[PDB]
Amino acid sequence: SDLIPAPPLSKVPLQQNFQDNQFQGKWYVVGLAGNAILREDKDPQKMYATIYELKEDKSYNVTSVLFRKKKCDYWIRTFVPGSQPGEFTLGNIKSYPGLTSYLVRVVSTNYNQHAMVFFKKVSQNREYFKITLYGRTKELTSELKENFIRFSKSLGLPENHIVFPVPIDQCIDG
Ligand SMILES: [Cl-]
Ligand SMILES: [Cl-]
Ligand SMILES: [Cl-]
Numbered sequence: 209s210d211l212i213p214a215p216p217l218s219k220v221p222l223q224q225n226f227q228d229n230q231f232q233g234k235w236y237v238v239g240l241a242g243n244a245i246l247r248e249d250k251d252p253q254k255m256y257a258t259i260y261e262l263k264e265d266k267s268y269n270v271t272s273v274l275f276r277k278k279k280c281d282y283w284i285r286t287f288v289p290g291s292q293p294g295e296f297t298l299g300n301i302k303s304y305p306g307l308t309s310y311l312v313r314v315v316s317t318n319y320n321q322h323a324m325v326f327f328k329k330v331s332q333n334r335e336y337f338k339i340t341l342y343g344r345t346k347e348l349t350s351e352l353k354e355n356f357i358r359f360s361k362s363l364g365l366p367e368n369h370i371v372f373p374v375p376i377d378q379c380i381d382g
C-alpha cells in the first residue's frame with residue numbers, strides 16, 4: 209500500500225559496452241534491495257540462483273531456482289533486448305496477470321565475478337523496483353557489498369530494505 213517511489217532512470221547507470229554473450233550462465237543472488245524487499249530475522253531469506261541463456265534471437269531465457277518447502281522451485285521468464293545494450297523488457301507480458309510494465313537494466317558487471325541489475329515493474333498499478341547483487345560465487349567481498357549498499361541507498365532505500373541472502377547448497381549447486 210505504501211511504497212518508496214521508483215527512482216528516475218537518470219539515477220540508474222547502464223553498463224557500457226554490454227557483452228550479452230559474457231553475461232550468460234549461473235549467477236547467485238548475494239544481495240537484494242527494493243521497495244518491496246523487507247529484512248526479516250524470524251526467517252532470513254535463503255540464497256537463490258538465476259541462469260541467463262542467450263537464444264538465437266539474442267533474447268535471454270532467464271531461469272531461476274530457489275529452495276522452498278524442501279523442494280526446488282523453478283520459474284522462467286524472457287528478457288527481450290530493449291533500447292540499448294544491457295537493457296531489457298519482459299517478453300509475453302500478457303501472460304502475467306496485473307503486469308503492465310517490466311524493465312531490466314544491467315548497472316555494472318565484470319562478467320566473471322560480480323554484477324548489479326536494476327529491475328522496475330508496474331503490477332496492479334503499483335510501481336516496484338529492486339536491485340540484485342549478482343555473484344559468480346556465493347560469497348563476495350566487503351567492498352562489493354558496500355558498493356551495493358551505497359547504490360541502493362542512492363535510489364532511496366533504507367538499510368532494512370537491503371538484504372543479503374544466506375548461502376545454501378540445495379538447488380543452486382546444479
Ligand atoms: Cl512485488
Ligand atoms: Cl534474479
Ligand atoms: Cl512464477
Ligand SMILES: [Cl-]
Pocket residue numbers: 304307331
Ligand atoms: Cl509480476
Ligand SMILES: [Cl-]
Pocket residue numbers: 318
Ligand atoms: Cl573489479
Ligand SMILES: [Fe+3]
Pocket residue numbers: none
Ligand atoms: Fe520478478
Ligand code: NA
Pocket residue numbers: 216217
Ligand atoms: Na523515465
Ligand code: NA
Pocket residue numbers: 275276277
Ligand atoms: Na520456506
